[PDB]
């Protein structure tokens, strides 16, 4: 990985030593990026609903994961399940349980630094994984991208700034998420997010990552070319808000 400090360095240390699981996948790969385009074709707002109990940005919500997932199955284009344990209070068991109960695509959201975590994702039922440019070297990103693709996943490559974007396009990422915060400060910077979205080629599937969201913000981002929205806080606090955001 790359040089890091603060809590990011700690979480990467944890990921490096995270033990791999042995498990049989129970369902085929359901492609998240392909379902997004199908939603786009029919002009249905495509929202990836995040399940996470905690976040360093202050989220703290206890909520039945199955009740949430089965609700979201009726409206969301996919689910993102955070499996980082120390700062997001996620677990592999939660991913496995949700993956065995819904039939929409599942993004495993963690700090992936080694191939065995992608094995974990596949074995537990995820349909794709998140890769973060800021914690990986370019050569690591390229290797893990190819590794994920060998399983038939197209990973979501998460970018924060223009240097991230250059790396992402150089390695051939086809599915790119754009952050609205930066990791170290946590400060929201929506101007930078809109700036980056406009620099991405139109044939890349683009995902805007948001905590709090409103319909007018969604509409503006869609006009700028965003294909889908990865939304956490608004929906963890108020699942039913997804109806307003779509209609």
# of chain residues touching Cl ion (CB under 5 A): 4
Supply the Cα-derived Rg of the chain in whole angstroms: 16
For Cl ion, the closer CB: 33 or 55:
55
45 vs 160, which CB is nearer to Cl ion?
160
Q: Rounded distance, CA 121 to CA 126, Å?
A: 5
CA dist 121 and 18 (Å) reads 13
By beta-carbon proximity to Cl ion, the closer residue of 49 and 99 is 49
Per-residue burial over 94-133, b if 16 or more Cβ lie within 10 Å, else e, is bbbbbbeebebbbbbbbbbbbeebbbbbbbbbbbbbbbbb
Residue 91 or 192 with smaller CB distance to Cl ion: 192
Contacts of 78 (CB under 8 A, 6+ apart): 32, 35, 36, 48, 49, 104, 105, 106, 107, 127
Instruction: Tell me how far, at minimum, the Cβ of 20 lies from Cl ion, in Å.
Output: 28
Residue window 174-213: x/- pattern of binding to Cl ion, with contact defined by CB under 5 A: -----xxx---------------------------x----
Q: CB of 181: closest distance to Cl ion in angstroms?
A: 4
- Which residues, 61 to 120, sit near Cl ion by CB under 5 A? none
Find the shortest distance in angstroms from Cβ 97 to Cl ion. Answer: 26
Any contact of residue 156 with Cl ion (CB under 5 A)?
no
Q: Least CB distance from residue 209 to Cl ion, whole Å?
A: 4
């Amino acid at each position: 990985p790359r040089y890091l400090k603060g809590w990011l360095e700690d979480v990467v240390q944890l990921s490096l030593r995270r033990p791999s699981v042995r498990a049989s996948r129970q369902r085929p790969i359901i492609s998240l990026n392909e379902r997004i385009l199908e939603f786009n074709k029919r002009n249905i707002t495509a929202i990836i609903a995040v399940y996470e109990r905690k976040s360093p940005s202050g989220l703290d919500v206890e909520r039945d994961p199955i009740e949430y997932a089965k609700f979201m199955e009726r409206y969301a284009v996919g689910l993102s399940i955070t499996t980082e344990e120390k700062y997001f209070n996620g677990s592999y068991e939660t991913l496995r349980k949700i993956a065995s109960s819904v039939s929409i695509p599942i993004l495993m959201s963690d700090f992936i630094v080694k191939e065995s975590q992608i094995d974990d994702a596949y074995n537990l039922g995820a349909d794709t994984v998140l890769l973060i440019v800021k914690i990986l070297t370019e050569r690591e990103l390229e290797s893990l991208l190819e590794y994920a693709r060998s399983y038939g996943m197209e990973p979501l490559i998460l970018i924060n700034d223009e240097n991230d974007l250059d790396i992402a396009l150089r390695i051939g990422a086809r599915f790119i998420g754009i952050m609205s915060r930066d990791f170290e400060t946590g400060e929201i910077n929506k101007e930078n997010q809109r700036k980056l979205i406009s620099m991405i080629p139109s044939n890349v599937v683009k995902v805007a990552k948001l905590g709090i969201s409103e319909r007018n913000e969604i509409e503006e981002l869609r006009k700028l070319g965003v294909n889908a929205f990865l939304i956490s806080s608004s929906l963890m606090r108020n699942p039913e808000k997804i109806k307003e955001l779509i209609e």
